[PDB]
Amino acid sequence: PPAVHLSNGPGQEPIAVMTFDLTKITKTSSSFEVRTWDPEGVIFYGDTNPKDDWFMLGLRDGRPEIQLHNHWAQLTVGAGPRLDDGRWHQVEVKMEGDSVLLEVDGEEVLRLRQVSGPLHPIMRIALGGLLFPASNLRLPLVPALDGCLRRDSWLDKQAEISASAPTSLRSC
Amino acid sequence: PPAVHLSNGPGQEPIAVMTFDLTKITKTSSSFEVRTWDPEGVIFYGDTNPKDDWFMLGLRDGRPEIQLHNHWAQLTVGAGPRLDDGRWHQVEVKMEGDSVLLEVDGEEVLRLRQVSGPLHPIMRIALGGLLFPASNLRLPLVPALDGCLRRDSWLDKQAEISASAPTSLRSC
Numbered sequence: 001p002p003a004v005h006l007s008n009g010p011g012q013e014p015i016a017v018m019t020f021d022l023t024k025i026t027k028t029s030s031s032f033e034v035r036t037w038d039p040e041g042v043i044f045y046g047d048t049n050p051k052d053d054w055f056m057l058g059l060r061d062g063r064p065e066i067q068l069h070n071h072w073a074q075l076t077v078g079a080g081p082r083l084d085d086g087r088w089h090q091v092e093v094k095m096e097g098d099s100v101l102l103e104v105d106g107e108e109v110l111r112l113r114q115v116s117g118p119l120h121p122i123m124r125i126a127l128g129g130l131l132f133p134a135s136n137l138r139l140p141l142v143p144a145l146d147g148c149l150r151r152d153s154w155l156d157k158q159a160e161i162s163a164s165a166p167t168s169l170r171s172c
Numbered sequence: 173p174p175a176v177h178l179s180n181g182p183g184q185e186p187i188a189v190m191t192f193d194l195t196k197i198t199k200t201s202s203s204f205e206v207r208t209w210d211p212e213g214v215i216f217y218g219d220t221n222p223k224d225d226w227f228m229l230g231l232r233d234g235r236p237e238i239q240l241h242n243h244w245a246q247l248t249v250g251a252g253p254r255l256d257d258g259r260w261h262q263v264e265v266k267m268e269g270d271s272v273l274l275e276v277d278g279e280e281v282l283r284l285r286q287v288s289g290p291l292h293p294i295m296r297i298a299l300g301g302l303l304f305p306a307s308n309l310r311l312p313l314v315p316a317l318d319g320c321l322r323r324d325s326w327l328d329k330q331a332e333i334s335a336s337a338p339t340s341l342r343s344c
């Protein structure tokens with residue numbers, strides 16, 4: 001299937017930004033396959049507020065890292081196996097009650113409990129980069145992730161209000 | 173290549189809406205292939221203003237029809253061969269100086285001269301439907317077009333600010 005490149009050029013901004021109507025979402029999960037040799041970068045960022053309520057999933061030292069900041073919880077966590085072996089890996093990020101679950105190749109590798117109150121009119125999902133400077137993360141990293149993404153599904157497509165790509169979505 | 177369906181269900185609204193930054197456009201042309209048995213419908217609508225400055229390309233009696241309303245020109249024109257034979261046809265709509273050109277299967281079939289002043293911050297392109305009730309056209313038609321679209325390219329992708337799909341883009 002058609003794989004896209006997770007970072008154009010110098011990796012300063014996301015390849016794509018989706019905007020979702022929060023009252024319309026009935027699917028609170030995302031899933032995709034990624035392939036990379038890059039140990040560090042952003043895979044995707046999500047927010048309901050860029051100052052207040054945000055999430056990032058990336059790689060640090062080859063392994064998944066989640067940063068989360070909202071009314072309930074503020075955290076920086078690494079978990080799961082290294083993904084930076086150049087092989088395709090399946091990833092799923094799900095909200096299940098008040099938890100956020102991370103699954104890798106079908107196996108749960110992480111569960112952040114007591115982090116989310118009820119699913120802030122709009123949620124944005126940014127692929128390959130953040131919607132704020134990396135310096136404002138809890139723990140900065142260099143956002144550019146040189147890898148591929150394919151078979152991706154972001155929340156509930158029925159609730160997507162719009163999608164923007166700043167430049168050209170490149171092939172992998 | 174992947175063809176999409178030009179009308180979901182009862183054909184009241186477009187399948188997809190693209191928004192473009194008018195100062196950024198350097199390509200003032202659009203092109204696509206269509207396949208249909210339906211003699212009447214909208215193929216695409218474009219506006220810089222839904223009251224003031226709009227364009228529609230559709231079929232009426234099987235044949236291309238353009239409606240255009242702007243500061244320079246107000247018109248309803250039919251031209252070209254019937255397209256409602258269920259075969260793939262190549263269509264290109266281009267602005268060339270102050271004209272709007274329509275080409276079918278590589279051949280110019282229509283040139284609307286003296287219709288456009290210089291290429292209103294934003295242009296919208298709506299596929300398969302209008303962004304106003306069909307009753308407000310110069311000459312109403314029933315907008316639903318049961319056909320396929322593939323190999324489509326809309327203006328200058330570098331100038332696209334966002335794209336929205338209200339429901340599910342179906343396969344053809």
Ligand SMILES: C[C@]12CCC(=O)C[C@@H]1CC[C@@H]1[C@@H]2CC[C@]2(C)[C@@H](O)CC[C@@H]12
Pocket residue numbers: 028029030045046047048053054055068069070071093094095100116154155
């Ligand atoms: C991980 C989730 C939920 C699961 C998913 O598909 C992606 C998405 C990313 C944005 C997160 C969201 C869970 C709830 C959060 C953390 C909000 O509190 C603010 C950002 C939201």
Ligand SMILES: C[C@]12CCC(=O)C[C@@H]1CC[C@@H]1[C@@H]2CC[C@]2(C)[C@@H](O)CC[C@@H]12
Pocket residue numbers: 200201202217218219220225226227240241242243265266267272288326327
């Ligand atoms: C046909 C054009 C120009 C060529 C094209 O690719 C599609 C686009 C549709 C909107 C039209 C535009 C030409 C200029 C118009 C007619 C403006 O005056 C208002 C709507 C614009």
Ligand SMILES: [Ca+2]
Pocket residue numbers: 038039040041142143144145146
């Ligand atoms: Ca990197």
Ligand SMILES: [Ca+2]
Pocket residue numbers: 210211212213314315316317318
């Ligand atoms: Ca019809």
Ligand SMILES: [Zn+2]
Pocket residue numbers: 049052053071120
């Ligand atoms: Zn909040």
Ligand SMILES: [Zn+2]
Pocket residue numbers: 088089090104105
């Ligand atoms: Zn794996």
Ligand SMILES: [Zn+2]
Pocket residue numbers: 221224225243292
């Ligand atoms: Zn005007």
Ligand SMILES: [Zn+2]
Pocket residue numbers: 260261262276277
């Ligand atoms: Zn033909």
